[PDB]
């Protein structure tokens, strides 16, 4: 098992010079993604309020077979490029395809 | 793809939308969901399979 | 697995659509209905059947 681990570590050392290039290219892509989508991944619970000022109070939710007054929340998407670390995670989830 | 009472983001109506749907099926993400929607769009499990 | 996805949680005497898009069963390890619903005989299945 130590020999197999050493083989795996040798492979990791073999691809380490391309891992750095990969991480650099994904870093330029992450910074471009930040500059494109920094602060833009925000939304209201209702799809009619386009600002945080407008996104206070209650609204009519026509999605539960009965109307109900759900609160208006100015939330953020899960993966949102608001940061270089967040952009790296978002682009990693994109690269895995999920 | 308008039978669901709303057209999906991955539709084949316009050419940009069709090319993006084909690219997403090539990347292999949710290609089965597009397959289900395209089977129901052409009938259903009964005749659109 | 032939025909095992067709029993869904159906309401009582209502002849309505099932609640939840999941198969069910009355046996021990299968998924059981809850909230006064029954596993009836036909529901096309998950992903439009």
């Amino acid at each position: 098992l130590k020999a197999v681990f050493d083989c795996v570590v040798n492979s990791l050392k073999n691809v380490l010079n391309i891992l750095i290039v990969y991480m650099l290219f994904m870093f330029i892509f992450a910074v471009i993604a930040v500059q494109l989508f920094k602060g833009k991944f925000f939304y209201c619970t209702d799809e009619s309020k386009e600002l945080e000022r407008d996104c206070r109070g209650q609204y009519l939710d026509y999605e539960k077979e009965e109307v109900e007054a759900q609160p208006r929340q100015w939330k953020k998407y899960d993966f949102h490029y608001d940061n270089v670390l967040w952009a790296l995670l978002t682009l990693f989830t994109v690269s895995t395809g999920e | 793809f308008n039978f669901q009472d709303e057209t999906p983001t991955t539709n084949f109506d316009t050419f940009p939308a069709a090319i993006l749907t084909v690219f997403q099926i090539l990347t292999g993400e949710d290609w089965n969901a597009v397959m289900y929607h395209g089977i129901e769009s052409q009938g259903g499990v009964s005749k659109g399979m | 697995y032939m025909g095992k996805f067709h029993k869904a949680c159906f309401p009582n005497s209502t002849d309505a659509e099932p609640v939840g898009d999941f198969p069910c069963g009355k046996e021990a390890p299968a998924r059981l209905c809850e909230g006064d619903t029954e596993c009836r005989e036909y529901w096309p299945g998950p992903n439009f059947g």
Binding site: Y43, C44, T45, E63, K64, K75 | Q4, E6, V34 | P46
Partner: peptide, 25 residues
């Protein structure tokens, strides 16, 4: 953006904070 538990379609991707699984966010 459909809330949690709302009836959704998979291909719509309008399922803020989650994903459309078994027709429900």
């Amino acid at each position: 953006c459909k809330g949690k538990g709302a009836k959704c379609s998979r291909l719509m991707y309008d399922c803020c904070t989650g994903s459309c699984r078994s027709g429900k966010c």
